[PDB]
Design a protein around this ligand. Sequence first.
Ligand SMILES: [Hg+2]
Ligand SMILES: [Zn+2]
Length: 259
Amino acid sequence: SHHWGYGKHNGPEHWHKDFPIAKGERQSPVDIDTHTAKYDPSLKPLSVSYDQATSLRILNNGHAFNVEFDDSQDKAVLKGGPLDGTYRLIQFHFHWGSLDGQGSEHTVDKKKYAAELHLVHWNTKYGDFGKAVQQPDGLAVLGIFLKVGSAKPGLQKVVDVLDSIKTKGKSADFTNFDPRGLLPESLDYWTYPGSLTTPPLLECVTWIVLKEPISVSSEQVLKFRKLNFNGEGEPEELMVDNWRPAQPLKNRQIKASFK
Ligand SMILES: [Hg+2]
Ligand SMILES: [Zn+2]
């Protein structure tokens, strides 16, 4: 990691040299063993309130693409469930595979989905994202699995802008995108305490992983796979397999919101 990435020489097995927390006590993702996960009656109802979300821009950062939100006001927020207080949406992104049989970060009884959507939120008690990532309860990431089947209509606007952000460092205006169109019907979830799944791997995250996947079409995920990890005018390296494998569960319990 000389810069970190997803290749043989810079990928997840190397991250620990620059980021020793990679071998920490609460790393993500994990495998979700559905039989061992326990219903938790202490969880409150989950509230995903995205009606006033204001997207701004879409960016290829060289590892994935981020759809960024204006988080300067109390707008798109996550609350309830395992969370204490209010968490504000700052960005979402995906992780995906070279083939439909892999791509997710979390696994469910060892099953890998084709991709995984991460809606990233910071705890408003800490003022900003940067202060939030110095806290054990600074972030909440809502994770949603993607399987290949029917198209997700609400994803198409993302897909259709990807040609403008092919390479690392490119961005495009991306206003008026409604992340409600990326959610499944059910909010049933699993939750556990973990980390960022990319460097700096900080152990700040309450993970909330929905049980119900969304379906996206083969054509939609094929367009993800046309993105590039490299920058413009550099040798093409397709942006595929940008997922970290499951990490040791260590001294954690995964709780279920459902019976
Ligand atoms: Hg960060
Ligand atoms: Zn992620």
